[PDB]
Amino acid sequence: SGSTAEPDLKTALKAVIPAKRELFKQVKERSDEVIGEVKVANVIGGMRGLKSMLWEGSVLDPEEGIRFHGKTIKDCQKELPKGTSGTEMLPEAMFWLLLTGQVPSTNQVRAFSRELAEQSHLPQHILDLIKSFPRSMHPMTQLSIAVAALNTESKFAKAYEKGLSKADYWEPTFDDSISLLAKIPRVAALVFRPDEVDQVGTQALDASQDWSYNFAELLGKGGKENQDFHDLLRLYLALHGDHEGGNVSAHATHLVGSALSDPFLSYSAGLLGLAGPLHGLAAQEVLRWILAMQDKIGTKFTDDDVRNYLWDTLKSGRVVPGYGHGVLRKPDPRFQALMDFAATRPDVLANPVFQLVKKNSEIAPAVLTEHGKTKNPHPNVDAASGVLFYHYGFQQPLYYTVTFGVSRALGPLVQLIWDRALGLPIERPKSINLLGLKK
Template sequence: MLWDASVLDPIEGIRFHGMSIPDCQKQLTAAPGGKEIIAESMLWLLLTGKVPTEAETRQLSRELAEKGDLPKHVVDLIDSLPQTLHPMTQLGMGVAALNHDSQFAAAYEKGIKKSEYWTHTLEDCINLIARLPALAARIYRNVYKPGTPLTGINKDLDLVGNYVNMLGYGHNHDLTEYLRLYIAIHGDHEGGNASAHTAHLVGSTLSDPYLSYSAALFALAGPLHGLANQEVLRWQMNMQKEIGTNITHDNIKDFLWKTLKSGQVVPGHVYFDSVLVCLSISFSFYVDTATFCDTRPELLADPVIQLVKKTSEVAPDVLKEHGKTKNPYPNVDAASGCVLYHYGLTEFKYYTVIFGVSRSLGALTQLVWARALGLPLERPKSLSIDAIQKLVEGQ
């Protein structure tokens, strides 16, 4: 498929319109008083291929803040859902319900030229990205902090600054900075991953962006995709419980073999994908998260983060010896969850919702370009088992 905003290289890692993660950190705008990339600057780059000025970034922040409030019917829907319903299910439902106000769907029903599809799609995508923090924060408060008031949107803050405020952690500057980095660099991972591909597929039917992205979120909710970061942290904490404070390479190695011999995978290291180029991104993001930790002594002193770092040193050799892992090196999920946990965001099931806020940056901008370029309905050829067997026998 055509996917223009990001490209993965097995040696260089990911590039966003030709820019590496370090390039982005140097050139893309940070929040006032912060150092990390903000979502708006990455969104501008992904959508246009150009680095925004600081003034352009601040203008986009203001626009997103002004459009960020949820309509009443979505508030009522989310507030009516049981606390026991998985946060990702709630997020997908909320995004789908936002299509009540889809400008693309309304314009298409009235009859518009195909050449105008992208303009209405862009409006929907900007509105959806703007509303995701309020939606995601409301779900968090309802499930984990019921009865606590939700902070309103501050028109002078960036998207993630408002998101963290609404979560109730606005006082935590380091968590805010980490989530700015996390959401910016998780925004686009080429188009072949399950969530981005789902948005592309559903969007190719001319479903509006809300329906397309709600489908993407349900793909992201799978344990082999976005749910992995909570599984990594759960596994690491089980290891910590078993080996205690005696964190040695030998003890970690024993626990790794225990996991593998029980028929389980090692979360955060085993990434099943047959194409090497799609694996390089995992290590790029792991290194970037590790670098964030390296600049903060309090993170390096955290026992769980120490365990993660030492596991990343031991696991590759164990997995190579085991022989069934295509890429034994740590991926992005190996480190991201433990940092969130350290900063007090301890609700595992919520981590994928944060990923869902981030992934919108890439999947939705590519949907705009798919409409602008008039890309066709996606319809891959399918084969029966008999046809596959004949194909194999013919080789």
């Protein structure tokens, strides 16, 4: 008899592809319109400030923070479906929104969550590969490699090799994207649990549960005793999914993808960028810094004690980690979302490590402004994420970037699908040497 089921994700995307192609055609008619200037600063300064790439699902306002299809984080928290338990927005609902431009129904998200659970299994060769990693290989190196290795499972790579019309690129791109999303929490958990590859690598995920819940189970933090952690993980993964196109991981994914490398190879390149100290490692560094501060001033500390430690940091020529940003000039709404997560949880508010993060957030911006060397003295999301993981017993900060890697698949994979749906060309700017800028 007849389906009761609402459109699935691929069907929902199909519904909106023609309109985006039409908008693209209209913009293309204005190809020759001048929208800005290039200065020497832009070339030597890593393209900072230069509007030079397309990204559909999110736009970062320097004053107001990230928007997803023009919606605030608070809007998304209110409107996006939640899990069968808990109160935080689901990252798979965020993926739906980023891709389609629409808020899915709870029933649509339930069906998508089932697909992600079902598609999470791995080839035996991937488990063999992971078992070959030395114990001391950095977790982000492990994650990047294992994601690239999954290109053995790429429908796009195989279809292209057999002969694929340009018009038919988006669908295998979509298929590979969902495959990767389904698999990456398991890969991440394998990086976290090298002594349990055979179990973690094969265990069936509960297809009635959400992506974050099942990630937490694979991490060994399943069960009702970890329900607050499940909600933290949902929120964290949703908040870190996309931050417009110019951030290193998103951009690298787009760049590699633009040569028609498949989504596995493309997001591997994004992960290699996340492995960079100036891009993915800050949340780890923040927690190390806070804990080092705590060791010095104690669990009972004054505002002056914190000010003094901040001044010593700056006088020493070092940055206060988790403060400032390449684009944001004002408080990061992702930071406030994570602090507000703590607001309803007395155990978190009582945690001296959280209290130190909180107090630092109240003191550091004035100190940084007085010191005068930053363009943005405000906290960014990395100021808060680590301590919340730490509170819930995820206390090995080397793996905080691995969780970032899982989240940050979301937005860049959405854009790769659109890149292919629209037929965007290879990304290939022109370079110049210093001699050419001199004369």
